[PDB]
Paper text:
[name] is a sequence specific type II restriction endonuclease that forms polymeric filaments with accelerated DNA cleavage activity and expanded DNA sequence specificity. The [name] filament is a left-handed helix with approximately 4 DBD per turn. [name] is a divalent cation-dependent DNA endonuclease, and analogous to many DNA nucleases, likely uses the two divalent cations in a two-metal-ion cleavage mechanism.
The first structure, resolved to 3.3 Å, contains the active site mutation [name], which inhibits DNA cleavage and leaves an intact phosphodiester bond at the cleavage site (hereafter known as the scissile phosphate [SP]). To make the SgrAIK242A/40-1/[name]+ filamentous assembly, we incubated [name] [name] with a 40 bp DNA containing the primary sequence CACCGGTG (termed [name]) in buffer containing MgCl2 and incubated for 30 min at room temperature prior to cryo-EM grid preparation. We observed filaments on cryo-EM grids and collected a dataset containing 3488 cryo-EM movies of the sample. Image processing using previously described workflows revealed a map resolved to 3.3 Å, which was sufficient for visualization of [name]+ ions. The structure of SgrAIK242A/40-1/[name]+ shows that the phosphodiester bond in the mutant form of the protein is intact. We were able to model 2 [name]+ ions in the active site, in sites A and B, and the absence of the K242 side chain is evident. Mutation of this lysine results in greatly diminished rates of DNA cleavage. Consistent with these observations, our structure of [name] containing the [name] mutation showed no evidence of DNA cleavage, despite the presence of the biologically relevant and catalytically competent [name]+ cofactor. The terminal amine of the [name] side chain remains within salt bridging distance with both the nucleophile and the SP, suggesting possible roles of the lysine side chain in catalysis, including positioning the nucleophile and SP for in-line attack, activation of the nucleophile, and stabilization of the transition state. Interestingly, the absence of the K242 side chain results in a shift in the position of the SP toward the space left by the missing side chain, consistent with a role of the side chain in positioning the SP. In addition, the distances between the carboxylate atoms of D188 and the [name]+ ions in both sites A and B in the SgrAIK242A/40-1/[name]+ structure are relatively long for direct coordination (2.9 and 2.8 Å, respectively).
Residue numbers in the entry:
A (entry chain B): 2 to 299, 304 to 339
B (entry chain A): 2 to 339
DNA sequence: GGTCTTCACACCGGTGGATGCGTGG
DNA sequence: CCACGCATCCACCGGTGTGAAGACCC
């Protein structure tokens, strides 16, 4: 459950608990006595509650409390089980909190995408959570798909192979000189649903929670669209970077600087809307150092990062995503 | 001293100690009970010993132990003074160790540059540490200057005003659209000594240690060259990034990707020899993801394409860094006429 | 206008998991 | 002579030290 409950933790299986005791089975070059299991805590805390689509006390709750509830639940569970012995270095809580932010925001915008698709097909506009109805003409061809890209994806395998051959041969020509184009995969891709996927019912049902089958469904959602996305159908790219610093904001920038290079200067796409989400952009000047330029081609100059967002609540992210979808989907024809 | 000594630590003044007790004077948004004094630690440990130019036991010692000795000295000092109460979070030891790595390597290469300048001017080749004499023709115009760039420098102020006007105009044109070219300053810049400084005796004396006056001298070495180097006279840039990861290594790459953009695509310089130094490149593939491209110039081919990072280095010992710097200077100074 | 306090810059180290590989029927 | 399992890599963030700049009471 969202709030910690002793009975539900007791009823959990040994291999399904938030904290795994690996004192007797150490990792090779680490001293992690107790290991947080981010999948298990995600399925435990956000099992029946998804932020922005749950009771009105969770949608309006500060996002820094929703993203950080699973770590509190894990710490309480570990204290309950291994009392006077539980200890996790903050360098594990940081990684786990970042991954939880990534997955929770991806789930929230996946629910938003499912609601948008349901509206576009013609199944009405669900009003259980009070959200404004978009002022766009419904159309099955305007539907959207939210992909949570994996840890070490290629991000080009999504492209249609008639437009992937040029990118592959560009990389091959670069490889002849012992060079490359390395990049980190953007943490989420919002694309236009392909033509043959607009009758599927899996893109129109909101997930009840982030259970393990739902985690598998969300994580593996990119496989179904592998090789079915046109270069211009990549509507948005999102980098989830919680609490940026003055040197860690240059990884997303590169993540965009290469991205446009492979979509603007070599594929003819109009623009790439790469944007960064963060929770605590303090101790940094990210609001003014994210106005960086790009490869500029030769006119063709623009911001590398479209915007930086700091979601106040969990519902504000959903509202902003709905507004952005309403603003952009009008460009496509359906 | 290098090895911890109780008497010398006791003789230190309260404001000159490695660890500062700021429990009663907390920082604004932090809970740092004890603050490591990076400058005081550097002046205490490396106060009379510079790695690579000291006794043969320190030159050959593993670099991961030389870079990490001051933190051990501070921990021992704090345990000695605030017993049963000293504790500093590893997120402070990491920052301190990185800064110590940067400053110590900068001092080592500064000593190498001083020896090279002494050889070029005509004072022979000092042979107290056994280093190979470069096989290059001595000339006062081949002298090199090592600058330890500050935390929030610009690195464009170093260029001559004639060659800075084009960069400033490009930045102003970008600024007209609400844009910019932000970048992190490379941690060190090796440049060719300006002709008007080629007789100063300051760039030819090896520092005996990293004392506070010598720390100030090394840190403020860039001020004297503010607007006196040529676009083609920036010999090399060095990013000291200790123990890279699979996501932090993209910060130096950008630091180079912008750099060439302002030296090759807007100044006509032949090439920029940006390179990265690290101690523990484990848990990553930095040896392969540092073959990245650049602004790529023309469409394709071998016209204006090259590695953004020239090479990744992992110094085994403290003397190996000096040997590599000497070899690089000898190999690449024949390009400059003299 | 001179101490004093505050904020941004660049620092790294300890991790969880998906995935390609090591060895044995 | 293909497997079940262990090993390596990818991307995560949070706690800091110091220098330059704002405060401000003159
Ligand atoms: Mg991220
Ligand atoms: Mg560095």
């Amino acid at each position: 459950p969202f709030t910690y409950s002793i009975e539900a933790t007791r009823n959990l299986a040994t291999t399904e608990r938030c904290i795994q005791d690996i004192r007797n089975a150490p990792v090779r070059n680490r001293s992690t006595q107790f290991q947080l299991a981010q999948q298990n805590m995600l399925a435990y805390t956000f099992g029946e509650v998804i932020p922005g689509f749950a009771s009105a006390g969770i949608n309006g709750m500060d996002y820094r409390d929703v993203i950080g509830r699973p770590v509190e639940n894990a710490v309480t569970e570990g204290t309950h089980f291994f009392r006077d012995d539980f200890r996790v270095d903050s360098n594990a809580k940081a990684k786990v909190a970042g991954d939880i932010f990534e997955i929770v925001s991806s789930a929230v915008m996946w629910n938003c995408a499912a609601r948008w698709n349901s509206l576009m097909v013609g199944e009405g506009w669900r009003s259980q959570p009070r959200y404004s109805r978009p002022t766009l003409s419904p159309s099955p061809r305007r539907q959207v798909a939210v992909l949570n890209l994996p840890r070490s994806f290629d991000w080009v395998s999504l492209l249609v192979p008639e437009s992937q051959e040029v990118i592959e041969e560009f990389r091959a020509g670069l490889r002849k000189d012992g060079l490359g184009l390395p990049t980190s995969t953007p943490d989420l891709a919002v694309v236009v649903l392909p033509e043959e996927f607009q009758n599927d019912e899996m893109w129109r049902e909101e997930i009840a929670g982030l259970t393990r089958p739902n985690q598998i469904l969300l994580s593996g959602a990119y496989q179904r669209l592998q090789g079915r996305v046109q270069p211009g159908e990549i509507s948005l790219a999102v980098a989830f970077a919680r609490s940026l610093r003055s040197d860690r904001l240059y990884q997303p920038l590169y993540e965009a600087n290469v991205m446009q290079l492979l979509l603007e200067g070599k594929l003819g796409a109009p623009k790439v809307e790469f944007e960064v989400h963060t929770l605590a952009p303090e101790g940094t000047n990210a609001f003014v150092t994210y106005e960086a330029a790009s490869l500029y081609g030769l006119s063709a100059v623009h911001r590398a990062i479209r915007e930086l967002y700091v979601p106040p609540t969990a519902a504000d992210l959903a509202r902003r995503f709905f507004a952005f979808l309403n603003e952009r989907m009008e460009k496509v024809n359906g």
